[PDB]
Amino acid sequence: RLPPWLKTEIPMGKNYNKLKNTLRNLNLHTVCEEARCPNIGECWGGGEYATATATIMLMGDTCTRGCRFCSVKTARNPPPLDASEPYNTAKAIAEWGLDYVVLTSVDRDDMPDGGAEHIAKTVSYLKERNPKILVECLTPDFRGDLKAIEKVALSGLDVYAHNVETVPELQSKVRDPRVNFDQSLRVLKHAKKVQPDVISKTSIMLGLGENDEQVYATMKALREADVDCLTLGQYMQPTRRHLKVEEYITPEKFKYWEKVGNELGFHYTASGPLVRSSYKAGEFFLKNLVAKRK
Numbered sequence: 471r472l473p474p475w476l477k478t479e480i481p482m483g484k485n486y487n488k489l490k491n492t493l494r495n496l497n498l499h500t501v502c503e504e505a506r507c508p509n510i511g512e513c514w515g516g517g518e519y520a521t522a523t524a525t526i527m528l529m530g531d532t533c534t535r536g537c538r539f540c541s542v543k544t545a546r547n548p549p550p551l552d553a554s555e556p557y558n559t560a561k562a563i564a565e566w567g568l569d570y571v572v573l574t575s576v577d578r579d580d581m582p583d584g585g586a587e588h589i590a591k592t593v594s595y596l597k598e599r600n601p602k603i604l605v606e607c608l609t610p611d612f613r614g615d616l617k618a619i620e621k622v623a624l625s626g627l628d629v630y631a632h633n634v635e636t637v638p639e640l641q642s643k644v645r646d647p648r649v650n651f652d653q654s655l656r657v658l659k660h661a662k663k664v665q666p667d668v669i670s671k672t673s674i675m676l677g678l679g680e681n682d683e684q685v686y687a688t689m690k691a692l693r694e695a696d697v698d699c700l701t702l703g704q705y706m707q708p709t710r711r712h713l714k715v716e717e718y719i720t721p722e723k724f725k726y727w728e729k730v731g732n733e734l735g736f737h738y739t740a741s742g743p744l745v746r747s748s749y750k751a752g753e754f755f756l757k758n759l760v761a762k763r764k
């Protein structure tokens with residue numbers, strides 16, 4: 471029986487309903503719906519600024535790697551690249567009227583640049599169509615290919631996100647051995663080197679056995695790498711094959727880590743059991759970076 475802080479009420483807001491109705495006549499899938507995310511009523515217009523945030527996966531909604539913690543659907547092979555997806559997806563997002571979109575993609579080992587040009591093309595169409603829409607790219611590490619990272623970071627996005635997922639001592643238990651903490655930090659550093667204007671962001675999951683000393687040291691290492699924004703949320707086991715949850719971190723302990731993030735100087739620290747990288751991302755951006763007056 472899950473603790474009650476991992477549950478939400480059914481989404482019922484006026485803004486949620488309007489976004490939901492409009493989406494149904496568009497040709498566009500969201501992670502929000504596909505993953506049955508409990509946060510949809512809050513992200514789709516439910517917050518203080520009434521912003522609409524959603525997450526859209528580019529280059530297919532499955533991954534072949536089968537990582538031990540990951541909730542993305544597994545498939546034995548990658549799907550084909552749709553050359554019309556950058557144009558069509560940018561068009562649909564702009565018509566839908568999101569305020570903040572997280573464009574995300576899985577590890578595409580089949581492509582030399584990991585999909586970086588395809589991602590950058592999508593950002594470029596979207597920013598040409600509606601420069602008011604904020605754009606975050608949440609990407610894999612591109613095997614540390616600095617040119618692929620540069621392609622995404624120069625694309626015109628607002629936020630470059632790349633997740634470290636756990637503390638260094640748990641990387642081999644949790645993440646695939648093709649990735650690691652140092653390489654992920656080098657991604658974030660390189661994005662800021664080539665585009666110093668971009669906001670850098672990472673996310674970590676708690677509940678995988680990390681201790682407080684390890685979490686704090688990780689947060690300090692991220693500040694040293696000039697990471698602007700951080701999210702911390704609960705690891706939820708997708709199926710019985712995936713890693714067991716070591717513990718459900720309490721609501722107040724997540725609030726402690728928010729305080730720690732504030733003190734270490736992150737521009738925002740989104741922290742809570744249901745947090746993930748995209749959770750209310752447009753609201754965190756407007757409140758904490760833009761400082762928008764209501």
Ligand SMILES: OC[C@H]1O[C@H](O[C@H]2O[C@H](CO)[C@@H](O)[C@H](O)[C@H]2O)[C@H](O)[C@@H](O)[C@@H]1O
Nearest residue numbers: 623624626661662663664665666667668
């Ligand atoms: O806000 C002033 C400008 O800051 C940036 O431009 C400076 O920093 C760039 C590297 O990030 C340099 O290439 C540039 O020559 C500097 O002027 C920003 O990119 C500009 O858009 C701003 O106008």
Ligand code: SF4
Nearest residue numbers: 533536537540576577
């Ligand atoms: S963490 Fe990334 S590489 Fe691993 S299964 Fe998930 S999407 Fe694929």
Ligand code: SF4
Nearest residue numbers: 502507510513748749
């Ligand atoms: S947390 Fe992310 S995936 Fe979930 S509803 Fe919000 S934007 Fe969508």
